[PDB]
């Protein structure tokens, strides 16, 4: 009995958890990519030139099947997040857009 209202409400709660988590964390001493929410997952502060990881967000309907997965994103050398984001580990195990369109 999954509705749009429930999924959106769970996403909003995840977003709120990310805000509070980032607000409580002390920012680091030196250069680092800023902790941020990218509409999908919460990113902690990351070291420059390091690959950040974030657990698959719990609001996903299929979260139990990807609980041990991680989203990946690179922190640039100058302390700016890269644009690339890999959430393949967090995809629905039954993903297939061609048959969904069918």
């Amino acid at each position: 009995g999954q509705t749009a209202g429930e999924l959106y409400q769970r996403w909003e709660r995840y977003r709120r958890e990310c805000q509070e988590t980032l607000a409580a964390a002390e920012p680091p001493s030196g250069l680092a990519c800023n902790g941020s929410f990218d509409m999908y997952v919460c990113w902690d502060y990351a070291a420059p030139n390091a690959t950040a990881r974030a657990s698959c967000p719990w609001y996903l309907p299929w979260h139990h099947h990807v609980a041990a997965g991680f989203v990946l994103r690179q922190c640039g050398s100058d302390g700016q997040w890269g644009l690339w984001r890999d959430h393949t580990q967090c995809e629905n195990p039954e993903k297939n857009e061609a048959f969904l369109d069918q």
Partner: antibody
Amino acid sequence: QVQLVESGGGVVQPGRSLRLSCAASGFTFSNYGMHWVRQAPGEGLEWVAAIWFDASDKYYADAVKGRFTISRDNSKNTLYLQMNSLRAEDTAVYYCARDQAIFGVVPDYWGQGTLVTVSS
Amino acid sequence: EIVMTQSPATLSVSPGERATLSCRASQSVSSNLAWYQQKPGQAPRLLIYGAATRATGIPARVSGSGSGTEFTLTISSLQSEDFAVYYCQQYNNWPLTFGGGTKVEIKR
């Protein structure tokens, strides 16, 4: 800031197909769901379709079930609407709209629309 | 589909007066309801979501209330830009649906 511009509108014969596109700028396209909404001349807003930020799922209005297909190319910052078996009552301005989140629940910023005329 | 019905179809209000618009859902949509404004020749405009939360840039004179099946949009003092068509929309479940619209015209 947010800019959505629709393209591909025009005249199509009844029963034929047409595809609209929407180019996004001023925000990170891959972080948001998207919507299509249409408005017949002199009429109200009618939701058409929506799509996840990563196309995980797609949703359609009853009026277009089995005929329309929404999709997106994040590398080109473009949203698409493939329309098949068009009928005269599909004539409308078609709006591209960004979702407030990543699923397609609330269109929070809208484009200007493109007119689609289904006629012989 | 969840049927959204707005009343009245046309609301006649004097400038500076309060406009009170009604939206009804055919079944409970909790607080998963949004309101939009549209001027002729212009794209729609998000005003309220969550039945009562104003979008960014929306003045305090616009307020939304309600939950379940009955909602209200209120603009306490209409300015020139406030005369337009207003739509409600539920996102409790897909397919998303808009109300038929309520036109707010200048009374004379």
